[PDB]
């Protein structure tokens, strides 16, 4: 299995900053693509940001210009540097990662080569 | 039942067909019940259906088992020189199960190909749209669309008494005039059952082919730079540094067309100006001043090639003679000589299409290393 | 007419 441990959540005032981390453990090979998802209460889950092993990032329109996602391919860790946090961003942020086995056939009927994390709470109060 | 007059009562009636075709149906039956049952056992009981592709692969094996249930009915049908003793109800079910399995199996491969394009190319943006609820709703629509397509096989398929030979057969009666049967029922199997889905399957895997090529060629460009940088460090004359720096400039422009790459290529062009003038020590320092285990399968293109061609060459014999059946029905051709070669090859094309189709849930399963693991533990 | 007796 490819486990994902996330850390950095916390209750911060409105307009503050935060930096979420997520290191991939248990992978013999490098993770392909990692990113962050958040689930607002009563609302469906959405993709916040993702970054590939090359450095290409894709941000959502609700966090573009504020959140800055980065990673370190050596340690297989992704960092979500959140700035100017709004009370709309109050959600449980989940970590995601795509890791393929050796000699990958790109077919996985067990986990679709996709692995999640436990979840860290991020609350932004007024 | 109805009494009809067959235009070509000898078309397709050959002794080598009455012996070989029932034997082939028995091989498809034994191999199909063996393979598709193990796919269900491994997926539903040892994997508990955790992915979208597992739902498609499970229903791909279930729909094949339903077709094989009526396969012995067609085996003895061809054995008794095309005599149908199972009544009118059992043929409306058997002929529908053949038509239902065609559309359902081909639709499932279409959505499974689309799912493979989204999972490989857009893993993060298409993850929330590809859920278990979507996969099951897709399958119930595939069942309805296949049942809606096999609807003429339940309304017009009847048991007909042939006055020419006193032989009771089950068939579609292509009546010359005032026929209640739709004209182009075989055209529906051509475009909806083959043309349109194959173009979606071919497009899905072509996009995967191009995506993996862009990624693999990019990794090859970085490997060319680092290997040549090691060649420059171990170089001893101006020719070894010139050959390595030339390969680095060409690889840098290849990696750019995949954006500070012009800054790297400009510095390689500066190192080339030193190696050309006989400066070997000055060229090594320039390359040394400017500048890891990703999974990769160079045989995935052979797998993509095999997946596309296995779907095409397995159905293209059946669809061609099905289209030839439409020309005979429309009146474009009325010769009983070409009706014989069409009525003889049609059981051959069915033996080719549905034998390969009943091996699809097994072949797609072996692509997953976890499925291959549980499969061999069952046989061990 | 024609007889499409195939499965
Ligand atoms: C004519 C048909 C409908 C009747 C028999 C079909 C079913 C019950 C048969 C077909 C093939 C069979 C499987 C063939 C091989 C094995 C591997 C063995 O280590 C355990 C039993 C197991 C897993 C069999 C279980 C029963 C099975 C799934
Ligand atoms: C009729 C059966 C048609 C079966 C066609 C199977 C085609 C297999 C294939 O095309 O494999 C290509 C691969 O590149 C090989 O190296
Ligand atoms: C059936 C006869 C053709 C063999 C099918 C086949 O598998 O071809 C072998 C190889 O893959 C060729 O690329
Ligand atoms: C079919 O049966 C009729 C009698 O009902 C008979 O006259 C005819 O020759 C038969 N045709 C055959 C056996 O081909």
Domain containing residue A16: 1-126
The rounded distance, in Å, linking the Cα atoms of B235 and B228 is 10
Give chain C's radius of gyration (CA, Å): 6
| Contact between residue B194 and residue B38 where contact means Cβ atoms under 8 Å apart | no
**Cβ(A109)–Cβ(A5) under 8 Å?**
no
DSSP state at residue A79: E
CB B57 within 8 A of CB B112: yes
CB of B119 within 8 Å of a chain A CB? The answer is yes
Check residue A54 and report its DSSP letter: S
A86 to A10, A62, A68: CA distances (angstroms)? 13, 10, 15
Identify the H or E element spanning A7: strand A3-7
Q: How far apart are CA C2 and CA B343, in angstroms?
A: 11
Cβ(B116)–Cβ(B51) below 8 Å: no
Beta strands in A17-67 (DSSP E): 17-25, 33-39, 45-52, 57-59
Q: Which atom of ligand 2 is nearest to the CA of B301?
A: 14
Residue with tokens 């109805």: B2
At B153, list the tokens.
């096989």
What is the chain B residue with the closest CA to A101? B295
- Assign A35 to helix, strand or coil: strand
Resolution in angstroms comes to 2.7
Residue with token string 């009562």: B9
CA B214 to CA B211: how far, in whole Å?
5
Query: Which three-class secondary structure state does DSSP give residue A87?
Result: helix
> CB A105 to CB B369 under 8 A?
yes
Collect all residues with Cβ–Cβ distance below 8 Å to B304 and sequence separation of at least 6.
B205, B208, B209
Q: What CATH class does B210-290 carry?
A: mainly alpha
Maximum CA pair distance of chain A? 51
Q: Is the dihedral of CA B161, B165, B167, B170 positive or negative?
A: negative
Contact B341, B12 (CB under 8 A): no
Alpha carbon distance B214, B221 (integer Å): 11
Instruction: Select the residue of B74, B174, B347 nearest C4 (Cβ to Cβ).
Output: B174
B321 near C CB under 8 A: no
Going from the Cα of B305 to the center of ligand 3, the distance in angstroms, rounded, reads 12
Q: Does B366 contact ligand 2 (Cβ within 6 A)?
A: no
Structure tokens at B132: 């278990």
Tell me how far apart the alpha carbons of residues B130 and B357 are, in angstroms, rounded to a whole number.
25
* Residue A82 to residue A1: CA distance in whole angstroms: 29
Using CA atoms, how far apart are residues B175 and A107, in angstroms rounded to an integer? 49
Among A113, A112, A114, A27, CA closest to A73: A27
Contact by Cβ (8 Å): B318, B349: yes
Residues 6+ apart with CB under 8 A from B256: B262, B265
Helix (H/G/I), strand (E/B), else coil: A60: coil
Residue indicated by tokens 């970085």: B222
Please give all residues whose beta carbon lies within 6 A of any atom in ligand 1, as ranges: B 33-34, 37, 41, 378
Tell me how far apart the alpha carbons of residues B174 and B330 are, in angstroms, rounded to a whole number: 9
Residue of B nearest to A96 (CA): B124
Closest listed residue to residue B270, CA positions, set B256, B250, B254, B286: B286
- A 30-69: CB under 8 A from B: 30, 32-33, 35, 37, 44-47, 50, 53-54, 58
Going by C-alpha positions, the residue among B5, B3, B4, B7 that lies closest to residue B340 is: B7
b/e per residue, B267-292, with b = 16+ CB within 10 A? bbeebbebbeeebbeebbebbeeeee
Nearest to C2 among B7, B74, B98 (CB): B7
Inter-axis angle of helices B52-69 and B360-367, nearest 10: 160
Task: Using the Cα atoms of residue B156, residue B159, residue B163 and residue B167 in order, give the sign of their dihedral.
Answer: positive
Per the CB < 8 A criterion, the answer to whether A95 and A36 are in contact is yes
Nearest-CA neighbor of B322 among B189, B142, B133? Answer: B189
Give the CA dihedral A99, A101, A103, A108, nearest 10 degrees: -90
Three-state DSSP class for residue C1:
coil
Contact partners, residue B134, CB within 8 Å, separation at least 6: B52
Task: Tell me the C-alpha distance between B81 and B62, whole Å.
Answer: 30
Q: What is the DSSP letter of A45?
A: E
Within 10 angstroms of residue B200's Cβ, the number of other Cβ atoms is 18
The rounded distance, in Å, linking the Cα atoms of A4 and B378 is 32
C-beta neighbour count of A37 within 10 angstroms: 22
Q: What does the buried/exposed string (b/e) look like for B351-372 if buried means 16 or more CB atoms within 10 Å of the residue's CB?
A: bbbbbbbbbbbbebbebbbbbe
What's the token pair of residue B250? Answer: 């060409």
Q: Could you tell me if residue A112 is left (phi over 0), alpha (psi between -120 and 50 degrees) or otherwise beta?
A: left
* Token output for B375: 């499969």
Residue whose tokens read 């008494």? B161
The method recorded for this entry reads X-ray
Strand partners for A122:
A10, A91
Nearest to A89, CA basis, from A7, A34, A18 = A18
Q: Which residues are CB-neighbours of B184 under 8 A, at least 6 positions away?
A: B326, B330
How far is the CA of A106 from the CAs of A2, A95, B270, in angstroms?
16, 21, 42
Assign residue A10 a region (left: φ > 0; alpha: ψ between -120 and 50; beta: otherwise): left
Whether B368 and B40 have beta carbons less than 8 Å apart is answered as no
Q: Which residues of B touch A4 (CB under 8 A)?
A: none
Please state the separation of Cα B95 from the chain's center in Å: 23
- In terms of C-beta density within 10 A (0-12 exposed, 13-18 middle, 19 or more buried), how is residue A68 classed? middle
Q: Which of B72, B139, B79 is nearest to B103 (CA)?
A: B139
Q: What residue owns the CA closest to ligand 2's atom 6? A: B310
Ramachandran class of B327: left when φ > 0, alpha when ψ lies in -120 to 50, beta otherwise: alpha
3-state secondary structure of A70: strand
CA-based torsion, B64, B70, B76, B78: positive or negative: negative
> Does B360 contact ligand 2 (Cβ within 6 A)?
no
Contacts of A58 in chain B (CB under 8 A): 124-125
Host H or E run for residue A93: strand A91-98
Output the CA B119–ligand 1 centroid distance in Å: 33
3-state SS record for chain B? CEEECCCCCCCCCCHHHHHHHHHHHHHHHHHHHHHHHHHHHHHHHHCCCCCHHHHHHHHHHHHHHHHHHCHHHHHHHHHCCCCCCCCCHHHHHHHHHHHHHHHHHHHHHHHHHHHHHHHHHCCCCCCCCCCHHHHHHHHHHHHHHHHHHCCHHHHCCEEEEECCCCEEEEEEEECCCCCCCCCCHHHHHHHHHHHHHHHHHHHHHHHHHHHHHHHHHHHHHHHHHHHHHHHHHCCCCHHHHHHHHHHHHHHHHHHHCCCCHHHHHHHHHHHHHHHHCCCHHHHHHHHHHHCCCCCCCCCHHHHHHHHHHHHHHHHHHHHHHHHHHHHHHHCCCCCHHHHHHHHHHHHHHHHHHHHHHCCHHHHHHHHCHHHHHHHHHHHC
């Amino acid at each position: 299995q490819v486990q994902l441990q996330e850390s950095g959540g916390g209750l911060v005032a409105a307009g503050g900053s935060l930096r979420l981390s997520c290191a991939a453990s248990g992978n013999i090979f490098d993770v392909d693509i990692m990113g962050w998802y958040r689930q607002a209460p009563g609302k469906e889950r959405e993709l916040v940001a993702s970054i590939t092993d090359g450095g290409s990032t894709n941000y959502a329109d609700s966090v573009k210009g504020r959140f800055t996602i980065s990673r370190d391919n050596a340690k297989n860790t992704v960092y979500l540097a959140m700035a100017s946090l709004k009370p709309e961003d109050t959600a449980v942020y989940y970590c995601a990662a795509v890791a393929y086995p050796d000699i990958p056939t790109y077919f996985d009927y067990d986990s679709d080569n996709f692995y999640w994390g436990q979840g860290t709470q991020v609350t932004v109060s007024s | 039942i109805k009494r009809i007059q067959d235009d070509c009562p000898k078309a397709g009636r050959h002794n080598y067909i009455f012996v070989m075709i029932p034997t082939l149906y028995s091989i498809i039956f034994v191999v199909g019940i063996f393979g598709n049952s193990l796919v269900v056992i491994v997926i539903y009981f040892y994997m508990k259906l955790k992915t979208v592709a597992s739902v498609f692969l499970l229903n791909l094996a279930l729909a094949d088992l339903c077709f094989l249930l009526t396969l012995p009915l067609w085996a003895v049908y061809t054995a008794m020189e095309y005599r149908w003793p199972f009544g009118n109800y059992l043929c409306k079910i058997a002929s529908a199960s053949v038509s239902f399995n065609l559309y359902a199996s081909v639709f499932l491969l279409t959505c499974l190909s689309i799912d493979r394009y989204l999972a490989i190319v857009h893993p993060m943006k298409s993850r929330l749209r590809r859920t278990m609820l979507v996969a099951k709703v897709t399958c119930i629509i595939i069942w309805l669309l296949a049942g809606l397509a096999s609807l003429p096989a339940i309304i017009h398929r009847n048991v007909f008494f042939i006055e020419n030979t006193n032989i009771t057969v089950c068939a579609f009666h292509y009546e010359s005039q005032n026929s209640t049967l739709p004209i182009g029922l075989g055209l529906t199997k051509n475009i909806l059952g083959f043309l349109f889905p194959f173009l979606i399957i071919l497009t899905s895997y072509t996009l995967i082919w191009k995506a993996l090529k862009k990624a693999y060629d990019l990794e090859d460009n970085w490997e060319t730079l680092n290997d040549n940088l090691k060649v420059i460090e171990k170089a001893d004359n101006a020719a070894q540094v010139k050959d390595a720096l030339t390969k680095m400039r060409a690889a840098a422009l290849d990696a750019q067309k995949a954006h500070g790459f012009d800054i790297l290529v400009g510095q390689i062009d500066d190192a080339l100006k030193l190696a050309n003038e006989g400066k070997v020590k000055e060229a090594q320092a320039a390359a040394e001043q400017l500048k890891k285990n990703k999974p990769r399968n160079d045989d995935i293109f052979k797998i993509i090639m095999a997946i596309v061609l296995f779907f095409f060459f397995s159905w293209i014999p059946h669809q061609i003679f099905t289209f030839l059946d439409v020309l005979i029905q429309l009146g474009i051709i009325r010769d009983c000589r070409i009706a014989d070669i069409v009525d003889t090859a049609m059981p051959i094309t069915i033996c080719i299409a549905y034998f390969n189709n009943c091996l699809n849930p097994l072949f797609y399963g072996f692509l997953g290393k976890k499925f291959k693991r549980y499969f061999l533990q069952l046989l061990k | 007419g024609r007889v499409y007796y195939h499965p």
